[PDB]
Structures are given as structure tokens and as C-alpha cells.
Amino acid sequence: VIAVKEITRFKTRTEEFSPYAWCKRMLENDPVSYHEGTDTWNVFKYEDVKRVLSDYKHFSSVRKSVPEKIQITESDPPDHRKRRSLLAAAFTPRSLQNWEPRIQEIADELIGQMDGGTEIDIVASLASPLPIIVMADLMGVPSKDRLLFKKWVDTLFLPKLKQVAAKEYYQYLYPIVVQKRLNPADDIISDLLKSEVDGEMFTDDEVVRTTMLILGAGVETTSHLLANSFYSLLYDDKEVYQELHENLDLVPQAVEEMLRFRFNLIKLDRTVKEDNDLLGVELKEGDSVVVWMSAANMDEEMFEDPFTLNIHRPNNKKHLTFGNGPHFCLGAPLARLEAKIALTAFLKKFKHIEAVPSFQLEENLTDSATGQTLTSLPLKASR
């Protein structure tokens, strides 16, 4: 995969975490931008990004070791639609409905273990554990084996140790999969075993591997959102916290704004499949495209005062952090839900938060698939 850093040439981790300067420059000076080093055409404007992602005919997701029945992301029509549906049966609204109380409890539990005398590391205490545990419980891992699950997860999805983890994971999970085919429950594994689209169904092996792709998709990213939300409430605009506390009805909207403004730096790759000029330039088959959804989320043509955090900007929900078109994130309702709940619960308990002057950002960022991610975020909370 094309690495962010090669295109960006950022001196600091902090700048990759808060790239507002660069995004403005690219949006205004070089919106459709060839990068020789990576031989990559780089797309920044909302309208263009939106249209590249929607126009799969011309911008294919087929890449330039995984049973293609479960290769959803790296597939075009007509295959993609069927591969998506087999999974989507495990993420119905009903299931989100059902999952809320379970997710509620997991959150309460974790907020419980935070007091507010000592400094809290939100990352270790909430950002990382919540989605992992939620997946664990939502899939069908029993409560006691959670720590073992985290262990395989951290190893596999937080950047030979993995070889081991995979196998333990696989042989831990395969039995359970086999068990649940026989004795269904209300969970993802069970949902996925009953999934049938145009006759096709999942093999047990495919269900197991599907759970790995799910975790692959939805732990790093949700966790990044969470850590980042908190970073924002500490550093970006300190009034927001107090605003949210007094009116919890606003937390969803604030989540969209963290998705818009604070999920840096996310991109996607496509490959040109049929020659075209949709970006006002002729691209040819095999040309690689990279769309910078973080930048598009800061395009003034779409969002007013885009370089300011504003949770009341009425169109924040139109951000492209979850992509756009056929591949639009299947787990967005879940990620949104987890964050709503995680944030509400914490707001409901603590009244104020505060930064810690020792803590330096540079020292607590590492490379992730979505540009710099927080290793720890220490704060102090009251109540």
C-alpha cells in the first residue's frame, strides 16, 4: 500500500495529526496533484473525492491469501454487492437496536474503573478497550476469555508474533463458530452463519476469517476516533466539553464533527480501470489515485469555516471519513453508536477535564493506517 508519509513529507508527527495547514494549501493550490515519488494522483476537493469514490466504473477498488467470497473491500460490481450483503446481515438495525444495552454496560464498567484523583489515560482506559470488548461480546467470546482476545487483537490490529496470534485466534474461534452453526444465538457469528445471498453461504472457515476482517476494519479506527474526540475536548475548544455535559442531546453531532475535523489523516486508494477526465485531467488505465478524505472534509465549498470546530455546523454529517458510494463503511452506525455511548457515559460522570503539561504529543504518536495515532492521552477529570 501507498504510505502517507511519502506523499506528505511531514517533519513532525504532530503535523500529520493536525495537518490543517497542508490540507488548506493542497485544496487551494494543487487540488488534483500528481506526486512523482509514488506515481500517484492525489485528490483533495469534496466534490472530486465524492465522485471518485462513487464512480467505481472508472475508479476500481480491485488491487494492483483470502477467499474472494470475503474480499469485500477489494472488489467491484457485480461481485461487491453480494459479498457486502453476506456480511451486512450481521449488521442490521435490529442488531444495532439490540446491541445498545450490551454496549451501554461495557462502557459503564470501564468508566467505573476511572476515579478522578489520578490522571486517566483515556487510550488505555477507554479508547482501546471499549471497541475490542464490544466486538468480543458482540461476536460471542465469553466474558472470561476477554483478556486473551485483547491480546490477539492488539498483536494483530495495533501496529511472527502475529503468525502465532492468528493461529491461537483461529483455533479459539473455529470451535465456537462450529458450535453456533448448530446452536444459534443472537450474535454476529450466528448472524453470519445464517447469511445467504443468491444461494451462497459462508463456510466456517470463512466466518472465522470474516471476524478477523471485521476486527481489522473496526477496532483501530473506532479507537482512533475515541482518542481523538477526547484530544479535541482537551485542546481544540475547551467550551465544548461543558456544552456537551449540560446538553447530552448534542453528543451525536459532536461525533460527526470529530469525524469531520479530527480523524486525520485518512485516505483511500483506487486504480483507474477505464480512461477518463472526470477530475479535469486525463487519467489512464492502471493510474493510481489517492483521495484525501480528511482534506475533502475541510473544503470550504462544502463546509463553512471548515478550519474551525463547530458541532452545530448543520451539514457535518456529510463528511467522507466513512467513505462514499458502494464501499461506504458498513460499521459506521456501530462506530457512531460506540462513540455516542462512550462519550455520554463519561460526560454523565465527570464535569470538567484538564490537560497535563508534562504530556507532549510528539512523544505519544505512532504510525497507523490512518496517519498518526495516539499511544496515550493523559488527562485529569473532576467528580
Ligand code: HEM
Ligand atoms: C470510526 C470508525 C471507522 C471508520 C473511520 C471507518 C472508515 C471506513 C472507510 C473509509 C471505509 C471505505 C473503504 C473503501 O472505500 O475502500 C470503510 C469500509 C468498511 N468498514 Fe469501516 N470504518 C470504521 C469502523 C468500522 C467498523 C466498526 C466496522 C465493522 C465492525 C467497519 C467495517 C467496514 C467494512 C466491512 C468496510 C467494507 C465496506 C465495503 O467495501 O463494502 N468499519 N470503513
